[PDB]
Design an enzyme around this catalytic site. Structure first.
Site, PDB file in Angstrom:
ATOM      1  N   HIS A 166     -71.078  46.089 -20.921  1.00  0.00           N
ATOM      2  CA  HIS A 166     -71.629  46.162 -19.316  1.00  0.00           C
ATOM      3  C   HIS A 166     -71.910  44.732 -18.945  1.00  0.00           C
ATOM      4  CE1 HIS A 166     -73.617  47.261 -15.826  1.00  0.00           C
ATOM      5  NE2 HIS A 166     -74.796  46.701 -16.118  1.00  0.00           N
ATOM      6  N   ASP A 204     -74.862  43.037 -18.197  1.00  0.00           N
ATOM      7  CA  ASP A 204     -76.101  42.680 -19.393  1.00  0.00           C
ATOM      8  C   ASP A 204     -75.690  41.596 -20.329  1.00  0.00           C
ATOM      9  OD1 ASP A 204     -77.771  44.828 -18.330  1.00  0.00           O
ATOM     10  OD2 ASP A 204     -77.115  46.111 -19.989  1.00  0.00           O
ATOM     11  N   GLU A 208     -64.400  54.387 -20.381  1.00  0.00           N
ATOM     12  CA  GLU A 208     -63.737  53.402 -21.289  1.00  0.00           C
ATOM     13  C   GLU A 208     -64.155  54.002 -22.884  1.00  0.00           C
ATOM     14  OE1 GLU A 208     -64.217  49.448 -21.284  1.00  0.00           O
ATOM     15  OE2 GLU A 208     -62.516  48.832 -20.161  1.00  0.00           O
TER      16      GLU A 208
HETATM   17  N1  LIG Z   1     -60.603  45.219  -7.836  1.00  0.00           N
HETATM   18  C1  LIG Z   1     -61.303  44.187  -8.287  1.00  0.00           C
HETATM   19  N2  LIG Z   1     -60.807  42.835  -8.139  1.00  0.00           N
HETATM   20  C2  LIG Z   1     -61.605  41.901  -8.522  1.00  0.00           C
HETATM   21  N3  LIG Z   1     -62.751  41.734  -9.024  1.00  0.00           N
HETATM   22  C3  LIG Z   1     -63.300  42.943  -9.194  1.00  0.00           C
HETATM   23  C4  LIG Z   1     -62.690  44.315  -9.043  1.00  0.00           C
HETATM   24  N4  LIG Z   1     -63.393  45.402  -8.847  1.00  0.00           N
HETATM   25  C5  LIG Z   1     -64.410  44.931  -9.597  1.00  0.00           C
HETATM   26  N5  LIG Z   1     -64.596  43.327  -9.540  1.00  0.00           N
HETATM   27  C6  LIG Z   1     -65.467  42.552 -10.032  1.00  0.00           C
HETATM   28  O1  LIG Z   1     -66.030  42.928 -11.189  1.00  0.00           O
HETATM   29  C7  LIG Z   1     -67.535  42.962 -11.321  1.00  0.00           C
HETATM   30  C8  LIG Z   1     -68.295  44.173 -12.065  1.00  0.00           C
HETATM   31  O2  LIG Z   1     -67.999  43.725 -13.491  1.00  0.00           O
HETATM   32  P1  LIG Z   1     -68.970  44.025 -14.450  1.00  0.00           P
HETATM   33  O3  LIG Z   1     -70.449  43.689 -14.018  1.00  0.00           O
HETATM   34  O4  LIG Z   1     -68.539  43.715 -15.939  1.00  0.00           O
HETATM   35  O5  LIG Z   1     -68.904  45.860 -14.438  1.00  0.00           O
HETATM   36  P2  LIG Z   1     -69.157  46.835 -15.434  1.00  0.00           P
HETATM   37  O6  LIG Z   1     -69.257  48.260 -14.839  1.00  0.00           O
HETATM   38  O7  LIG Z   1     -70.147  46.367 -16.536  1.00  0.00           O
HETATM   39  O8  LIG Z   1     -67.516  46.928 -16.073  1.00  0.00           O
HETATM   40  C9  LIG Z   1     -67.391  46.676 -17.332  1.00  0.00           C
HETATM   41  C10 LIG Z   1     -66.174  47.246 -18.000  1.00  0.00           C
HETATM   42  O9  LIG Z   1     -65.009  46.286 -17.844  1.00  0.00           O
HETATM   43  C11 LIG Z   1     -64.201  46.682 -18.797  1.00  0.00           C
HETATM   44  O10 LIG Z   1     -63.227  45.519 -19.071  1.00  0.00           O
HETATM   45  C12 LIG Z   1     -64.964  46.709 -20.046  1.00  0.00           C
HETATM   46  O11 LIG Z   1     -64.304  47.395 -21.260  1.00  0.00           O
HETATM   47  C13 LIG Z   1     -66.080  47.524 -19.837  1.00  0.00           C
HETATM   48  O12 LIG Z   1     -65.962  49.004 -19.717  1.00  0.00           O
HETATM   49  C14 LIG Z   1     -67.971  43.294  -9.700  1.00  0.00           C
HETATM   50  O13 LIG Z   1     -69.177  42.415  -9.391  1.00  0.00           O
HETATM   51  C15 LIG Z   1     -66.884  42.299  -9.087  1.00  0.00           C
HETATM   52  O14 LIG Z   1     -66.915  41.112  -8.943  1.00  0.00           O
END
Ligand SMILES: Nc1ncnc2c1ncn2[C@@H]1O[C@H](COP(=O)(O)OP(=O)(O)OC[C@H]2O[C@@H](O)[C@H](O)[C@@H]2O)[C@@H](O)[C@H]1O
Ligand SMILES: Nc1ncnc2c1ncn2[C@@H]1O[C@H](COP(=O)(O)OP(=O)(O)OC[C@H]2O[C@@H](O)[C@H](O)[C@@H]2O)[C@@H](O)[C@H]1O
Lengths: 157, 165, 165, 156
Positions: free
Chosen positions: C9, C12, C75
């Site tokens: 996440h 975090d 995932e």
């Molecule tokens: N289409 C997109 N294009 C660009 N940036 C994006 C897009 N969609 C989301 N983002 C960015 O991703 C951010 C969210 O990322 P995290 O906070 O890491 O989100 P989380 O829900 O924790 O996703 C983690 C997940 O990512 C996978 O690679 C990994 O295995 C895990 O399951 C957003 O604030 C935004 O900036």
């Protein structure tokens, strides 16, 4: 090389400071940091020698007592050499948990599972009979430290 | 210095499943420790502690009545001692017994444990208990979940062989 | 070696512990999958499933808010599916979170989970729930038990290298 | 070479551990202890001082005495002062506000009015030494790598 177990409040500034100076002069590299932790257990297992610095308040700390139980456990299964220093405490007070040392030990036992207590108890009984260095019996602390540091050095060869 | 050390309650499994497991081992060149090969004259409890210390792998064959024997419990406490301090690998087989039923020493297994504690200090007793607490959380092989015991033994002997590194 | 898929996440751990972990990997020659390197114009979820399918190891970095994101749970459900059917090795890191809080869908982790389930068919809910049930019983690394995180990272990166051989 | 001053509870297990591994990889040998005078001599004798600031840094008057001594050595000796703003904003440091400031005033209640202001001047001053702000960095790992290289370079 060596893992010293001690109750810092009793000996850190005084006898322990001089001991660490003896070691370094002789090239000995000691390891210095109811909790203990897995990293602390790993360091004990990886020490050829462990020095048990026993003092009036060593048994007031369950951290110091958990260290003792692991050293005795490493003496049995691994080849760990355990060297004992009785600092202003008599070995029999340690074996029998008496005197002021005992009064501190029983306080560390208040509110404790009876199974922890005796794992500690068994450790103190055993370590009290490992031949070591008694401060009351020595002529001056400086010569005592020098004798310990040469013995540890030799054993490390 | 031995290859593999089996801990088991013979009355439950000696004549049966243990025999087949050991036949798989010899077939694959695996060298178990056989208690029946202790030289006569020797103290048995000293030969068992020494055999454990010298085993790369330890197979704990847990069964309903395993805790009725203080031999079986004293061994388990020694194996967990070798798992932590040495590099001993501990493999578990749950033979017609439930893993949590051992962890909390309840059910039919528990009634057998509490009886073996009579005339034992509460501290030795719990040295057994923590061993049961800990070993019950090592992922292993549950017999009830298998359709054919022979295939299970072949799976176990293959896992042991691979692990022998 | 190479293929590893980190599930985490980001809010975090992305900027903090995850960054250090990925720095350990490259130091040791491990080549992880970096989501930030998905080609732009691609669909994220299709690149993630393909990346999971192609990873020998998967590192699941669990945290209080992991279940607040359906990306992190989707995932996780795919990882458990690949462990069963493919040979994917699944390694767990419990970061300032308790294993049973994950297993019992409770604590602060659980309340973050129960909100992410609102407005979801009962089929999504339990596909996630069992995944949490399953991953929570995989022995892994608990951060609270470590006093120097840098050493923990070094222990993790060394285990991954070994497992890759 | 380097004297790090920190509030252990905030950073010991986390960021400081990674920093210390970065130093050792680069051959930098920091001074670790495990109010003062032997400590003052160690600060007096450190080429660089790294001020690792955190929310509760000011909850400890031991940490504040270290800052006043470091600033004293920057002035009279040639001590280089490196600043790390760890999940705390420099202006909260400069003006002693936020949670950082709230810990300061509690560490100041029942305290000489004279200690308070030498501490304040030190916080005001250190807050204006260009350093590394964690909020502004992309990942903690790259920031640490930048810090250890700057310290390493300066040490030559
Ligand atoms: N289409 C997109 N294009 C660009 N940036 C994006 C897009 N969609 C989301 N983002 C960015 O991703 C951010 C969210 O990322 P995290 O906070 O890491 O989100 P989380 O829900 O924790 O996703 C983690 C997940 O990512 C996978 O690679 C990994 O295995 C895990 O399951 C957003 O604030 C935004 O900036
Ligand atoms: N000197 C002896 N002392 C005791 N039993 C002996 C002896 N010599 C032969 N035996 C036979 O051993 C029997 C006990 O065998 P089991 O019931 O199979 O043993 P158990 O108590 O379940 O556990 C034995 C333990 O030995 C270890 O090798 C093994 O790992 C297991 O933990 C006895 O009834 C007896 O017939």
């Amino acid at each position: 090389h060596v893992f010293p177990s001690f109750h810092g409040a009793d000996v850190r500034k005084t006898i322990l400071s001089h001991i660490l100076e003896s070691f370094r002069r002789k090239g000995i590299d000691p390891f210095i940091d109811k909790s203990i932790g897995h990293e602390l257990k790993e360091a004990i297992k990886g020490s050829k020698i462990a020095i048990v610095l026993l003092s009036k308040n060593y048994a007031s700390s369950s951290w110091c007592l958990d260290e003792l139980a692991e050293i005795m456990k490493c003496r049995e299964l691994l080849g760990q050499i355990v060297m004992t220093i009785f600092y202003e405490v008599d070995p029999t007070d340690i074996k029998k948990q008496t005197g002021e040392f005992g009064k501190a030990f029983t306080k560390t036992c208040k509110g404790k599972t009876k199974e922890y207590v005796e794992r500690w108890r068994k450790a103190l009984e055993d370590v009290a009979t490992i031949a070591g260095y008694h401060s009351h019996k020595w002529r001056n602390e400086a010569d005592m430290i020098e004798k310990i540091a040469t013995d540890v050095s030799n054993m490390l060869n």
